[PDB]
Paper text:
Here we report the cryo-EM structures of mouse [name] bound to trimeric Spike ectodomains of four different VOC: Beta, Omicron BA.1, Omicron BA.2.12.1 and Omicron BA.4/5. The RBD is highly mobile and its transition between the down- to its up- state reveals the [name] binding site and allows for it to bind [name]. To gain structural information at side-chain level resolution of the binding interface, we performed image processing of the cryo-EM data by location-focused refinement on an [name]-bound RBD that was the most well resolved.
In patch 2, Y501 is observed to form cation-π interactions with H353 from mACE2, as in the mACE2/Beta complex, and new BA.1 mutations G496S and Q498R form a new set of hydrogen bonds and electrostatic interactions with mACE2’s aspartic acid D38. Furthermore, mutation of Y505 to a smaller histidine residue now allows for better packing at the interface and potentially a CH- π T-shape interaction. Glutamate (E) 37 also flips away from the interface and is now sandwiched between H353 and R393, stabilizing the overall conformation of the interface. Overall, Omicron BA.1 mutations Q493R and Q498R form a cascade of new interactions alongside the N501Y mutation present in preceding variants. The cryo-EM structure of mACE2/BA.1 reveals residues on the Spike protein that increase the number of interactions with mACE2: N501Y, Q493R, G496S and Q498R.
Author numbering:
A (entry chain B): 333 to 525
B (entry chain A): 20 to 603
Write the structure that this text describes.
Amino acid sequence: TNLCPFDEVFNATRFASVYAWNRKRISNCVADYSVLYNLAPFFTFKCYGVSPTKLNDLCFTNVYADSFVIRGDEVRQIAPGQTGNIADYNYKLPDDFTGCVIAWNSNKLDSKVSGNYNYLYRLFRKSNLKPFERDISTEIYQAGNKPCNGVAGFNCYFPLRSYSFRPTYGVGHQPYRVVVLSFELLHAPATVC
Amino acid sequence: LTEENAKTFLNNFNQEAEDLSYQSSLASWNYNTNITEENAQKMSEAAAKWSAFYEEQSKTAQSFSLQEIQTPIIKRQLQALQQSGSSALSADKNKQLNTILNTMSTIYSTGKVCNPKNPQECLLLEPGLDEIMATSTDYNSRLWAWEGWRAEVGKQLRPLYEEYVVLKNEMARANNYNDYGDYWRGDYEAEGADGYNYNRNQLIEDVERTFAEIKPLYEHLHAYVRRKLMDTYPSYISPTGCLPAHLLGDMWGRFWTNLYPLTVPFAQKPNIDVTDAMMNQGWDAERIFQEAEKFFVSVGLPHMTQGFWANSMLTEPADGRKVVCHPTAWDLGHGDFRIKMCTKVTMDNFLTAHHEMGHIQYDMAYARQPFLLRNGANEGFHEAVGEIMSLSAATPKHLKSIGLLPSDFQEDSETEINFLLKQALTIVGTLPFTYMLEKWRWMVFRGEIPKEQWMKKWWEMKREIVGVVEPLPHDETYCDPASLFHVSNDYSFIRYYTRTIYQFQFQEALCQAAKYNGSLHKCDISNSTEAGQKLLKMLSLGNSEPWTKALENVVGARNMDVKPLLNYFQPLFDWLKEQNRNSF
Ligand SMILES: *[C@@H]1O[C@H](CO)[C@@H](O[C@@H]2O[C@H](CO)[C@@H](O)[C@H](O)[C@H]2NC(C)=O)[C@H](O)[C@H]1NC(C)=O
Ligand SMILES: *[C@@H]1O[C@H](CO)[C@@H](O)[C@H](O)[C@H]1NC(C)=O
């Protein structure tokens, strides 16, 4: 029995920024969803698409477990077919999404004293992000007629802003580590069970 | 570039300003809790960064054009960013501006007041002991302890403010305004549709009906206090002269710590004994705020956040962490919602904790509005909303079910009248003072002439309006509107005026929504979910919608309504009416 990497992808010391989220392909692994919810009673495992019971006897193909750290309300923004600021420019889910989300309240892990700027989100994208697209690019955003030439300012905005997570924000703008499971059915032998 | 560029610029400003304002507020909180002049230095540098960024974004805002393009609340947000205050203009002109603000705040502490050249009973300026050593009802102690205070403050304040106001009104040449007096009152401009356009001169036309036609009603009350003063000691009101204003006891108009016991002629019914029931039962700072939160959530307002208790500083410090003693409700950017009140348990601390919790509840309603609209719908709304719960939580009917007062105390007739007299004398008499001070400020902001001929006319008008004057005049040495905290730094005064009317209107609306029989004062906001949502639908609005339309959508009111204030006492008014029949 080969236990699936839901340990080293959940208990990771640091997650990835939202504008560049790490998509982890996992296959040939037995998925023990029971062990996931054994850390405090404050999970937000509101599961979409499939039944709340994961049907551990139902076998899937490779599941795409990609994790990132967002705020509280942006957890609500992450949904199968809902608009906003982060579900349009950073992480969009298809209307026929199969799988669901897991969001923590990670305030004792990545809420560094005096603020940490290691978490960057993408604002001002100007074009709705197609589902499951990263777009890790550092190019100053242009809205006005004046062609920006590597210098920001009026009408030239840097599209990668910062969360600046630190404690004392509260139930609102605090780091909610989010990892979502994308269960895919693309022929092939079924391995994830 | 149209709304397409405006929305992106506004989003960028919101995102950056949120973090910068949170950092500034955190630095200010650290300074106020840990004053060591190093927190002062870091607070100063953070505030400098915030001011520089806000000025840059405001310059970009003026660079934008707002003729007709912006129909939605984007127009309101850009206007809020466009109000730049005293800034801009040529470098040569604004260079000397930085040399005025630094010395503006240093003029207050220059006055030392104690026994003249006497080491005995001389002490520095501290608010802790002033409130207990200044209020003294005596015929002699009020002469030099007051004339000297009034004189030694404005020794040269007028000859400097004469050009200060001129140079400040010269700034109005490039902000599409006309007068610095109109600058303050122009913040109410708000139009919603055709036929509801807001005139710039709405205040100067709607104030005559709300004040002048009912002035005699608020004048008989001033006659009531005249008769009480004579009984205590004779020679307090001259038959030919006028009562002195410097020996009234307090020019702050907060409370009367000496005249309250000597108010009811009978003086037989017992008074409240709240502290006796708080000290023994174990009520402290950690629990009074919890009781206030319980009261607020019994109406429908949400519970305070987990961090609110985590970082609040509701108790005295430990190791030399001096704090400026003042109850202030703090926002701290991203919904931190801290509260600063370093006080023990008393009668007034409970009620002011309720008022501060009302401030925090109002703050926890527009956290979804844009950063430029995360403010009260009006200057007077933010304090009035808290004061509504502050006054509503003070009724014995509220302090009979919790357990603070015994349940065997049946309500009495004269006791509730005595309770309402203090609250109807502490704030109702403040409205004439605020009105006269604001009208005097408006008239002197014009600066059309120095005082060489207006001196006699001003004092004649003051005598014929209220009828109080100093026994002897003074030379060019004093200035009246200088010795006060909220005039030293050039604040407004309509905030303390409209707050009373707004709070009474909201109280009337909420008690109407309560649908409770009985009397008009036993109605309480607690245990009224419908009243809770009726209040929340106004609190959770911010500056997105105009305050006029906000007040309209709740119950229907074009402007200020003093009729609810009058009807708050109309059912119980014969007691005062029957004691005013001995005059013609
Ligand atoms: C109050 O602020 C000071 C510094 O702003 C904190 O540090 C104290 O003061 C100096 C720092 O230059 C050093 O002696 C120590 O770092 C601290 N001294 C003591 C006696 O603690 C201080 O920790 C802050 N206090 C609180 C309660 O936050
Ligand atoms: C993660 O670490 C915790 C801490 O001991 C442990 O209890 C848990 O089993 C680990 N694995 C998870 C949560 O998948």
